[PDB]
Structures are given as structure tokens and as C-alpha cells.
């Protein structure tokens, strides 16, 4: 109940990845793999990550 | 090169639901499907991500609602339950029905547990969900996951 909830804002911290420093919106949580929604761009992208490479932000 | 016997059918009859680990380059596990079909089973090879809510698609009636391309109406099509319609429309002396799911990836753990319990409850129904990956064709029971 304390773990990563859907509906908030995130930002990726996995450095050796195509998606880096990207802020996203977490949309669905099944089996640990977290799928976040990226508003950046005209088409909204859904890219799957895991909890070992994500951390929520405090500013927004 | 790996002359495989019929141990695969014995692990299928033992576990009831086994997860396959196929090399991702193509057809190196279909020899086991043909061994399984030669022992009297009827394999039903279909793609797992096209199924949704396997409690409803496999054993329940489900409205398909095909694509109207701006021309027809909604026009719901009530597909029969796949496992029970393919099990009742079978020879009565057959070995059973086997659901051969070719994409075990992009599925949840809950659907794996449901598939294993579904193979355990009704008597002649086995699944060979292909979660993929491994360098050789190797299979586990669908016990832990």
C-alpha cells in the first residue's frame, strides 16, 4: 500500500537507456513491471519499466 | 542433434500445465507439439495476447463485437467458450485437448496461475504456455508462477 501507486508523476534514473531524464505518468501496475505514460510529443507513449530503475519526484 | 523421445508428453501428463522455454529464432519446439499430437492429443495453437480475461474467453461465453468500419452497427458476436467447445466437439476416446499458447510473455502471473488451476480442475485439458527465452527448449511446471 506504500509501494509505487498508479496516478502520480515519475522520472527515470536508469542512465544507460534511451529513455533517460524523462518525466512520465504511471498508468498500470502488474507484477512489479511499471508502465508509465509519456506526455512528451503529440502521440502519448507507454513505455514499461521496473521499480529498480524508477523514483518519484517531489517538485510536481 | 537432440533426438528427443516422448518424455514431453509424460511431463505434460504429470504437471498438467508446463511453461516452455523456446529459443526465439523459430521452430525448435514444434517437434514437441508434433510428439504431443502423435500420442492422441489435439493441440489448439493460438496466440495468448489476443485472448483477454481467460476466465471469460476460455470457459465462458464472450461477446466478440467485431469491427464495424463505420458501416455496420456494434453487432455483438457471442463466441462459444473455447476450451469446452473444442472439448465437446472432440472424439470421446481422445487423449484430451491442449492449448498451445505461443506468447507466454506479455501476460501476468495471475493468468499463469489461472491457467495452471484450470488444467488441474477440468480433467482433459493441458496448456503449454511458451514464456520463451532459453537457449535450448526446456520446460518447467507452472507451479511457482
Amino acid at each position: 500500500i506504500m509501494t509505487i501507486l498508479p496516478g502520480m508523476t515519475v522520472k527515470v534514473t536508469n542512465p544507460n537507456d534511451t529513455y533517460y531524464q524523462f518525466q512520465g505518468i504511471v498508468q498500470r501496475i502488474t507484477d512489479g513491471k511499471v508502465a508509465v505514460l509519456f506526455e512528451g510529443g503529440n502521440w502519448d507513449k507507454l513505455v514499461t519499466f521496473q521499480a529498480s530503475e524508477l523514483e518519484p519526484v517531489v517538485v510536481t | 542433434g537432440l533426438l528427443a523421445g516422448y518424455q514431453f508428453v509424460k511431463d505434460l501428463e504429470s504437471a498438467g500445465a508446463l511453461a516452455l522455454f523456446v529459443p526465439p529464432e523459430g521452430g525448435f519446439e514444434g517437434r514437441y507439439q508434433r510428439r504431443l499430437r502423435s500420442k492422441g492429443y489435439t493441440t489448439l495453437p493460438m496466440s495468448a495476447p489476443g485472448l483477454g480475461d481467460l476466465a471469460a474467453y476460455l470457459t465462458q461465453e464472450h461477446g466478440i463485437r467485431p469491427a464495424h468500419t463505420g458501416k455496420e452497427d456494434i453487432r455483438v458476436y457471442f463466441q462459444p467458450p473455447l476450451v469446452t467447445y473444442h472439448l465437446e466437439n472432440l472424439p470421446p476416446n481422445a487423449k484430451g485437448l491442449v492449448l498451445w499458447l505461443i506468447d507466454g510473455k506479455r501476460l501476468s502471473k495471475q493468468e499463469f496461475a489461472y491457467l495452471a488451476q484450470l488444467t488441474q480442475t477440468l480433467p482433459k485439458f493441458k496448456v503449454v504456455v511458451e514464456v520463451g527465452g532459453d537457449r535450448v527448449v526446456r520446460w518447467e511446471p507452472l507451479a511457482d508462477w
Binding site: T18, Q21, A35, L46 | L51, G70
Partner: protein, 189 residues
Amino acid sequence: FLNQITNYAKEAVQSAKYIGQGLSVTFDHMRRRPITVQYPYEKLIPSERFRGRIHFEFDKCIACEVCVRVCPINLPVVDWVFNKELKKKELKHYSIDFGVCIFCANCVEYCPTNCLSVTEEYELATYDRHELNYDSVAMGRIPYKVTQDPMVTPIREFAYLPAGVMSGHDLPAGAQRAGERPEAIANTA
């Protein structure tokens, strides 16, 4: 008059030198590293805009039909019954046939609730065509992540290779896209 005999031998030896030169420079093509993206073990990463399989969230849907009226073939079958106990639209069984879909994500842009998102998933091959009718729980699944498969060495294609790199095969350890991001010039200037 041997002006056309020596010209004949000159054309012959010029063609022979051309064949020898082209044979020397096609022998310098074998030493180059092959650019083959070896698919089942080297699945190349799609870009941050790819427009693969459409993802749908059954709870974020106000049951309008904007995703149908902007789709080029009016494809998504959204059907609702109005519940006068609550007086909202109350969607039931949204679905998209991905054998008919042309993957333009018009329905993704013109979605007022950001319900429809698009994924990086393209391996959608099926044996039966009617299995491409993804209903609301089928297309509400988490997509296949190419960088999280323990059999694939994923490859950035060309627009994510840093500033001098043409092919993503010689990449040492996850070097980023081109350079700085808009959180750098705000700190610079």
C-alpha cells in the same frame, strides 16, 4: 592501319584494370563489420515515438466517441448503455481490431482523458486473424519491453547514437542520445 587493333587491346586492358580495381575494392568490403541487426537476439529499440500496439485504460474512459470519429476507418468498437441511476455514459467492452488497424494513433492524440496511449510493441503476429480483436482487457496489458528481455542485446537505431556514431553496434556502455537536454541550458545561461 593498326589504329583499331591497339585501341582494341587498350580497351581490353582498361577493362582488365577496371575489373582488378573493382575486385580489390570489393575485397575491402569483407573486412567491414556487418551492420546486420540480428533480430531474435538483437531486437532493435523503437524510438520514443513509434506508434506500435495501442494501449487502453478501462477506467480512464468517459465513453465518448472521439477515438472513433478521428480514426480513419472508424475502427474502435466502443459501446455503452446510459445508466439513469448515475446519468453518465458507462462504457462496456471497448475493443480494437488490430488486423484492421493502420497504427496512426489518431485516436491517441484526440483522446480528451489521455486514455489511449501507444506502445513500443510490434510483434503482433497471429495464426488466427480473429485473435487480432483485442478487447479492453487484452489491450490493457503491459507491453513487451525490449530492454527487459534476457535474450536480447537491444540496439539504438540512428537517432539515439551520440553525435558521431552511425551504427549502434560498437556502443560500449549505453551512451546517450546526442548530448544535452533542456535542463542544461537553463543551468548554463
